[PDB]
Chain A
Amino acid sequence: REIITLQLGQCGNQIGFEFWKQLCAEHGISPEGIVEEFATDRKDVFFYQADDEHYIPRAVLLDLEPRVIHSILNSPYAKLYNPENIYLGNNWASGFSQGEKIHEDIFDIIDREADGSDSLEGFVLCHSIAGGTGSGLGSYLLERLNDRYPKKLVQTYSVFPNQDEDVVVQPYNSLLTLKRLTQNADCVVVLDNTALNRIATDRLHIQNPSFSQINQLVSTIMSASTTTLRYPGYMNNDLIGLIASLIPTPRLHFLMTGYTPLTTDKTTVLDVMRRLLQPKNVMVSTNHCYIAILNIIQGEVDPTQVHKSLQRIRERKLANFIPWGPASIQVALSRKSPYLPSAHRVSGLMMANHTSISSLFERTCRQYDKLRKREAFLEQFRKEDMFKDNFDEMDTSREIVQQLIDEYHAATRPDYISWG
Chain B
Amino acid sequence: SLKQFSLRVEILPSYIPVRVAEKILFVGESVQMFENQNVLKNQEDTFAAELHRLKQQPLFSLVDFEQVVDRIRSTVAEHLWKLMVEESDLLGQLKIIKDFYLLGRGELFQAFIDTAQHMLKTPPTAVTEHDVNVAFQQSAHKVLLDDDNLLPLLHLTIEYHGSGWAALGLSYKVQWPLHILFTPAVLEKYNVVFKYLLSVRRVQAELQHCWALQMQRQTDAIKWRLRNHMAFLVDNLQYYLQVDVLESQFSQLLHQINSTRDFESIRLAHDHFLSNLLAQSFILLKPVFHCLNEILDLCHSFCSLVSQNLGPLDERGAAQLSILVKGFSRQSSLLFKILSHQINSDLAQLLLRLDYNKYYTQ
Which A positions have Cβ atoms within 8 angstroms of B?
Answer: 150-153, 186-187, 234-238, 240-241, 243-245, 247-250, 253, 292, 303-304, 306-307, 310-311, 314-315, 317, 319, 321-333, 414, 416-419
B232→A328 contact, CB < 8 A: no
Chain A residues positioned under 8 Å from B352 (CB to CB): 310, 314, 328-330
Interface residues of B in 330-362 (CB under 8 A from A): 332, 344-345, 347-349, 351-353, 355-356, 358-359
Interchain CB contact (< 8 A) of A307 among B220, B232, B247, B347? B347
Cβ B216 vs Cβ A150 within 8 A: yes
20 A-B residue contacts at CB 8 Å? A150-B215, A151-B216, A152-B215, A234-B106, A235-B240, A241-B211, A241-B236, A244-B207, A247-B229, A310-B349, A311-B351, A317-B355, A319-B355, A321-B356, A325-B229, A326-B358, A327-B233, A328-B355, A331-B240, A414-B358
| B214 at the binding interface (Cβ < 8 Å) | yes
Distance in Å: Cβ of B8 to nearest Cβ of chain A: 43
Min C-beta distance of A128 to chain B, whole Å: 24
- A250 and B229 contacting across the interface, CB-CB below 8 Å: yes
B contact residues around A152 at 8 Å (CB): 215
Interchain CA distance A330-B349 in the complex, whole Å: 10
CA distance A412 to B78 in the complex (A): 63
CA distance in complex: A235, B103 (Å): 12
Residues on the B chain within 8 Å of A321, using CB = 355-356
Per the bound structure, the CA–CA distance linking A323 and B209 in Å amounts to 24
Chain A residues within 8 Å of B232, by CB: 244-245
Known A151-B216, A186-B215, A248-B233: A303·B240 in contact at CB below 8 Å: no
Cα-based distance from A332 to B244 in the complex (angstroms) = 10
Cβ contact within 8 Å between A322 and B236: no
Distance A416 CA – B227 CA, assembled complex (angstroms): 11
User: How far apart sit A240 and B214, CA to CA, in the bound complex (Å)?
Assistant: 9
> In the complex, what residues of B have CB within 8 A of residue A319's CB?
355
Check if B236 sits within 8 Å of A244, measured CB to CB: yes
Q: Is B62 an interface residue (CB 8 A)?
A: no
**Nearest CB on B from A409, distance (A):** 15
Q: Give B335's nearest chain A residue, CB to CB.
A: A326
Give B contacts to A, CB under 8 Å.
104, 106-107, 204, 207-209, 211-216, 219-220, 223, 225-226, 229-230, 232-234, 236-237, 240, 243-244, 247-248, 332, 344-345, 347-349, 351-353, 355-356, 358-359
- Contact A310-B348, Cβ < 8 Å, known A186-B214, A186-B215, A303-B248: yes
Which residues of the partner chain B approach A327 to less than 8 Å between Cβ atoms? 229-230, 233
- Per CB-CB distance, the 3 closest pairs between chain A and chain B, nearest first, are A314-B351, A244-B211, A325-B230
Which single member of B213, B233, B351 contacts A310 (CB below 8 Å)? B351
Cβ–Cβ contact B248 & A240, under 8 A: no
| B106 touching A151, Cβ below 8 Å | no
Indicate whether A234 sits within 8 Å of B243 (C-beta atoms), given known contacts A244-B208, A310-B348. yes
Residues in chain B near residue A307, CB distance under 8 A: 344-345, 347-348
A-B contact count (CB 8 A): 114
Query: B211–A323 contact, CB under 8 A?
Result: no
Q: How far is the CA of A253 from the CA of B214 in the complex (A)?
A: 10
Shortest A196–chain B CB gap in Å is 27
CB within 8 Å for A330 and B247 given contacts A247-B229, A311-B351:
no
Apart from A307-B344, A319-B355, A322-B356, what 8 extra A-B contacts exist at CB < 8 Å? A240-B208, A248-B229, A310-B351, A321-B355, A325-B233, A328-B352, A331-B240, A332-B240
Q: Is the CB of B214 within 8 A of A250?
A: yes
- Verify A314–B230 contact, CB threshold 8 A: no
Q: Which of A151, A248, A325, A332 contacts B215 (CB 8 A)?
A: A151
**Bound form: Cα–Cα A76–B226 in Å:** 48
> Do B234 and A326 have beta carbons less than 8 Å apart?
yes
What is the bound-complex CA distance between A330 and B243, given in angstroms?
14
Cβ-closest chain A residue relative to B219 = A419
Which chain B residues lie closer than 8 Å to A333 at the CB level?
Answer: 244
State in angstroms the CA–CA spacing of A311 and B344 once bound together: 10
Bound complex: CA A74 to CA B279 (Å): 62
Question: Which residues in A have their C-beta under 8 angstroms from that of B214?
Answer: 186-187, 243, 247, 250, 253
Q: Could you tell me the distance in whole angstroms from the C-beta of B303 to the nearest C-beta in chain A?
A: 13
The distance from the CB of A132 to the nearest CB of chain B, in whole angstroms, is: 30
Instruction: Give Cα A328–Cα B225 distance, bound, in whole angstroms.
Output: 18
Give which listed residue, B213, B219, B351, contacts A315 with CB less than 8 A.
B351
List residues of chain A with CB within 8 A of the CB of B244. Answer: 303, 306, 333
Partner of A304, one of B204, B208, B344: B344
> Are B208 and A241 in touch, CB under 8 angstroms?
yes
Contact of B212 among A151, A310, A418 (CB under 8 A): A151
Distance A326 CA – B355 CA, assembled complex (angstroms)? 9
Which residues on the B side are within 8 Å of A330 (C-beta)? 233, 237, 240, 352
Given A240-B208, A247-B229: A325 in contact with B348 (beta carbons within 8 A): no
CA distance A414 to B345 in the complex (A): 29
Nearest residue, chain B, Cβ from A237: B107
Cβ of A418: which chain B residues have Cβ within 8 Å of it? 220
Report chain B residues within 8 Å CB of A331: 240
CA A332 to CA B347, docked complex, whole Å: 16
- Which B residues touch A235, using CB under 8 A? 240, 243
Q: Could you tell me the distance between the alpha carbons of A249 and B61 in the complex, rounded to whole angstroms?
A: 76
- Kindly list chain B residues whose C-beta atoms are within 8 Å of the C-beta of A315: 351, 355
**CA separation between A241 and B351, bound complex, in Å?**
23
Q: Are A323 and B358 in contact (CB under 8 A)?
A: yes
* Shortest distance from the beta carbon of A48 to any chain B beta carbon, whole Å: 13
**Residues in A whose Cβ lies below 8 Å from that of B213:** 250
Report yes or no: B353 in contact with A328, Cβ–Cβ below 8 A.
yes
Contacts of B107 in A (CB 8 A): 234, 237
Complexed CA–CA distance, A152 and B349 (Å): 33
* With known contacts A307-B344, A322-B356, A326-B234, A240–B351 Cβ distance under 8 A: no
Closest to B212 in A: A151
Q: Let me know if A240 and B358 touch, CB within 8 A.
A: no
CA distance in complex: A156, B109 (Å): 30
In the bound complex, residues from chain A placing their C-beta under 8 Å from that of B212 are: 151, 240
| Partner of B225 from A248, A311, A416 at Cβ < 8 Å | A416
CB distance from A216 to the nearest CB of B (A): 31
Which residues does chain A contribute within 8 Å of B243, judged by CB atoms? 234-235
Residues of B within 8 A of A310 (CB): 348-349, 351-352
Name the residue among A152, A234, A319, A325 with the largest chain B CB count within 10 angstroms: A325
